[PDB]
Amino acid sequence: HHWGYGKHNGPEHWHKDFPIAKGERQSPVDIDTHTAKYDPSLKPLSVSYDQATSLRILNNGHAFNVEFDDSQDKAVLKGGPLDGTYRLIQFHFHWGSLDGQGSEHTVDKKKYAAELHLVHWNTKYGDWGKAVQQPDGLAVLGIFLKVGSAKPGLQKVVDVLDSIKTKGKSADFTNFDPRGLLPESLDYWTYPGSLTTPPLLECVTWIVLKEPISVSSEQVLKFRKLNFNGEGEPEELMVDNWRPAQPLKNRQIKASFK
Ligand SMILES: NS(=O)(=O)c1nc2ccccc2s1
Ligand SMILES: [Zn+2]
């Protein structure tokens, strides 16, 4: 892998190493709120994070992942458009160099300052590597961030970032409660899509919450002090690590709410 979000290895180049980048169910997409159809057959989402066990936070050179113990059913996502049980494996964000961009999904072409991805895999496939080979292998819960009032539940994440500034650095990150990152409402849009970084596999049921969370300018400024580069290498600020909207093609975006 040599892909990134720089001036010569960005999303417009990915198709050369990952031809599925030009596929029929790529993510993210623009959510046209007037075209998305209310589906009364969709169920309430069930976000069961009471027993979540966070373990570690890693700068992987494209974002930072907060990793969970997914060795058994602790934190799981069920219901909504989903059949079966999906285990939380990690969350990460995508963000911008300034507040007017950062999100991957857009809403009537509006870009949010950032987007949180809570990533889950379908336990019926036994492990992540098997799950990503299946069209219903993953469920990613996407939550928009706008800049305003501080999000108290995000501050523990913010405060550890200085310790994982560069690619390949990690730190212990136990006892973090991801419920503190959820908005009030679980109203959502859903559509079939893909991973938004290589390998871009078309194995995701996307669930994107309508209600954004508010974070402070100071919180997102700390995201923007991270580095894409490794220790001692020329500093490249980790900013604009988002893939733009991809063609919707023959896909329907459904709303859980009227
Ligand atoms: N950005 S995302 O679709 O949530 C995502 N992409 C990837 C790629 C490789 C491994 C895990 C994930 S999770
Ligand atoms: Zn993501």
d(CA 71, CA 55): 12
Chain position carrying tokens 């050179």:
61
Query: After which residues does a break in the chain occur, C–N more than 2.5 Å?
Result: none
Residue 1 annotated as binding site: no
CB 90 within 8 A of CB 120: no
Q: Which of 8, 13, 62, 120 is catalytic?
A: 62
Q: Is 254 helix (H, G, I), strand (E, B) or coil?
A: strand
Query: What is the residue with the minimal CA distance to atom 4 of ligand 1?
Result: 117
Q: Which residues contact 234 (CB under 8 A, 6 or more apart)?
A: none
- Output phi, psi for 100, to 5 deg: -80, 5
Helix (H) and strand (E) counts in the chain: 3, 15
Ligand 1 nearest atom to the CA of residue 198, by list position: 8
Q: Are 225 and 152 in contact (CB under 8 A)?
A: no
Helices marked H in the chain — which ranges?
128-131, 155-160, 217-223
**Whole-angstrom Cα distance, residue 112 to residue 213?**
10
d(CA 84, CA 136): 10
Annotated catalytic residue 62: yes
Query: Could you give the CA distance from residue 125 to residue 68 in angstroms, rounded to a whole number?
Result: 18
**Residue the block writes with tokens 């080979």:** 133
CATH architecture of 1-258: Roll (3.10)
Q: Solving technique for this entry?
A: X-ray
Burial class (CB in 10 A: 0-12, 13-18, 19+), 45: buried
d(CA 80, CA 111): 25
Which residues lie closer than 8 Å to 46 by C-beta, 6 or more apart?
Answer: 77, 78, 79, 80
Lookup result for tokens 């079939």: 192
Query: Which residues have CB under 6 Å of ligand 1?
Result: 117, 119, 140, 195-197
Closest-lying ligand 1 atom to the alpha carbon of residue 204? 3
Spans of all domains in the chain: 1-258
Pairing, β 138-147 against β 204-209: parallel
Alpha carbon distances (Å) from 1 to 166, 169, 242: 18, 18, 17
